[PDB]
From a paper:
Biogenesis of most membrane and secreted proteins requires the Sec61 translocon, an evolutionarily conserved transmembrane channel complex that facilitates translocation and membrane integration of nascent polypeptides. A defining feature of Sec61 clients is the presence of an N-terminal signal peptide or TM helix, which is required for cotranslational ER targeting and insertion. A structure of mammalian Sec61 in complex with an inserted signal peptide6 revealed that the hydrophobic region intercalates between Sec61 TM helices (the ‘lateral gate’) and thereby gains access to the lipid bilayer. Hence, a primary mechanism by which signal peptides promote the opening of the Sec61 channel is through dynamic hydrophobic interactions with residues of the lateral gate helices TM2 and TM7.
Here we present a cryogenic electron microscopy (cryo-EM) structure of Sec61 bound to a new cotransin variant 1, hereafter referred to as KZR-8445. We solubilized sheep ER microsomes that were pretreated with 10 µM KZR-8445, isolated the ER-bound 80S polysomes, converted them to 80S monosomes by RNAse treatment and subjected them to gravity-flow size exclusion chromatography. We collected a dataset consisting of 30,266 micrographs and carried out single-particle structure determination. This resulted in a consensus reconstruction with an overall resolution of 3.2 Å and local resolution in the Sec61 region of 2.6–7.0 Å, with poorest density in the N-terminal half of the channel. Real-space refinement and manual modeling revealed that the KZR-8445 macrocycle is inserted into a fully opened lateral gate. In addition to contacting the lateral gate where signal peptides ultimately insert into the lipid bilayer, KZR-8445 directly contacts the Sec61 plug helix and thereby prevents the Sec61 channel from opening toward the ER lumen. Hydrogen bonds between the carboxamide of N300 and the R-4 backbone carbonyl and amide groups of KZR-8445 were present during 91% of the accumulated 4 µs simulation time, with other residues primarily contributing van der Waals interactions. Consistent with a critical role for N300, ectopic expression of N300A Sec61α in HEK293 cells conferred resistance to KZR-8445 in the secreted GLuc assay. Competition with intramolecular interactions between N300, T86 and Q127, which stabilize the lateral gate in its closed configuration, may allow KZR-8445 to open the lateral gate in the absence of a signal peptide. Strikingly, Sec61 TM2 and the prolactin signal peptide overlap substantially with the KZR-8445 binding site. This analysis indicates that KZR-8445 and the prolactin signal peptide directly compete for binding to a functionally critical site within the Sec61 lateral gate. Nevertheless, the bulky bromobenzyl-Trp R-5 side chain in our cryo-EM model of KZR-8445 projects into the Sec61 cytosolic vestibule and would likely block many signal peptides from accessing this site.
Residue numbers in the entry:
A (entry chain B): 7 to 63
B (entry chain A): 11 to 45, 61 to 96, 104 to 133, 146 to 219, 228 to 310, 336 to 465
C (entry chain E): 1 to 6
The structure:
């Protein structure tokens, strides 16, 4: 029957309540690295698109 | 021997600094970045403009030999030439069948590209570890994310309206131009908001971890922590479900003559600006399919990848690391309290993020964005080595 | 090598 599914549910709540959620202070620095990498490499993507622009015409 | 007919990368036996490291791994990234469509997310063949062969030979070169085995630097020397040889054979096979999808010029060009990329695999893997295609997905996704500012002015055709000048900033043409138009043709505002929001939510969920206390066995006093990540599998469930999506839709395209027209609507990823509800049997149940799929894939990957509770306990025993209060055998139970359910809930939550990104309609159909964030975090984790 | 992963 379904009771083990509800047991899994309460397992999930217990795990989440036991998990170490990020706070604002470390979020502000962890997301910074993601933004920096995103920008620094999307820049190279945009540059190669720009270099493709003239070779077509 | 038969591997004596190929070259190989030089062995790093000296200190390998960050500057020259990006000079090796992050330079000559333009070769594939020069200039069955459901596989282009993972194999950006497209029209084969010198990018038609990635990942497909990279892993297979070794894994097909390992699989057929059932049919250390010394083993490296034994297999080094042969793995590349068979990778290039299968590369030529893929090229000729893609041609099926006189023409020797294009095939040999594809072979040259594959040769360069395979020989570069070991070059990137030494040290930082960007080989195995881990960079290709982010490379093909990052352009689809950022090049909106080039797609908006470069589209010379205007259709019924006028959009030749641009869409990011074109208010002065009418201002009064209204941005509250239909969000199906060029929805810059909604796409950007969805993209940044999904980035933010996946970052927030990414720092979820459980810190198990650990102590070194002989140095009584040295305390430490061991992290159990919430996903604990990163992209594996999403990768596997993307593989199933490909194997379904490309097969449907193959069998059509033998998804959004002329085909059954039994399974499909519901896409519509805002929302659409006409038959709940597919609009909502898609969420259940995705969630169960991701959870199952994570749960089976736990056993496949050798990251189960007992395996991790054995690794910790190998490293002499122990928990303070528990017998050397009861540590397995403490890990087991989290690891399996952590993996299952990671699958569920990552699927939920996928369906939320699909609902918001972010860039790249939600999938890949999660690959994007996980790959960036993997790069960060590798960069951690420089600081430790 | 045709489709995920041959």
């Amino acid at each position: 029957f379904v009771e083990p599914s509800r047991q899994f549910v309460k397992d999930s709540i217990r795990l989440v309540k036991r998990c170490t959620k990020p706070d604002r202070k470390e979020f502000q620095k962890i997301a910074m690295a993601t933004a920096i990498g995103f920008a620094i490499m999307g820049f190279i993507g945009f540059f190669v698109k720009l270099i493709h622009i003239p070779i077509n015409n | 021997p038969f591997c004596v007919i190929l070259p190989e990368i030089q062995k790093p036996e000296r200190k390998i600094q960050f500057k020259e490291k990006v000079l090796w791994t992050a330079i000559t990234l333009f070769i594939f970045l020069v200039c069955p469509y459901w596989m282009r997310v993972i194999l950006a063949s497209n029209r084969g403009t010198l990018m038609a062969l990635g990942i497909s030979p990279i892993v297979t070169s070794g894994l097909i030999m390992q699989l057929l085995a059932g049919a250390t630097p010394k083993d490296r020397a034994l297999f080094n030439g042969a793995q590349k040889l068979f990778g290039m054979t299968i590369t030529i096979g893929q090229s000729i069948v893609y041609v099926m999808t006189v023409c020797l010029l294009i095939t040999i060009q594809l072979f040259v590209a594959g040769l360069i990329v395979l020989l570069l695999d070991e070059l990137l893997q030494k040290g930082y570890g960007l080989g195995s295609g881990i960079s290709l997905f982010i490379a093909t996704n990052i352009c689809e994310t950022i090049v909106w500012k080039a797609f908006s002015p470069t589209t010379v055709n205007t259709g019924r309206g006028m959009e030749f000048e641009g869409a990011i900033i074109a208010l002065f043409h009418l201002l009064a131009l209204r941005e509250a138009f239909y969000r199906q043709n060029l929805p810059n505002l909604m796409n950007l908001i969805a993209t940044i929001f999904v980035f933010a939510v996946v970052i927030y969920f990414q720092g979820f971890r459980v810190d198990l206390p650990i102590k070194s066995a002989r140095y009584r006093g040295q305390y430490n922590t061991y992290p159990i990540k919430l996903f604990y599998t990163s992209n594996i469930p999403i990768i596997l479900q993307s593989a199933l999506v490909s194997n379904l839709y490309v097969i449907s395209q193959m069998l059509s003559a033998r998804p959004v027209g002329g085909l059954c609507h039994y399974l499909s990823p519901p896409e519509s600006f805002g929302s659409v509800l006409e038959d709940p049997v597919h609009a909502v149940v898609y969420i259940v399919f995705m969630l169960g799929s991701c959870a199952f894939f994570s749960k089976t990957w736990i056993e496949v990848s050798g990251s189960s509770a007992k395996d991790v306990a054995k690794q910790l025993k190998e490293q002499q690391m122990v928990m303070r209060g528990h017998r050397e055998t009861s540590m397995v139970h403490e890990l087991n309290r989290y690891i399996p359910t952590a993996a299952a809930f990671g699958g569920l939550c990552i699927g939920a993020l996928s369906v939320l990104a699909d609902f918001l309609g972010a860039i790249g159909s939600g999938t890949g964005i999660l690959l994007a964030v996980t790959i960036i975090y993997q790069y960060f984790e590798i960069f951690v080595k420089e600081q430790s | 090598x045709x489709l995920x992963x041959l």
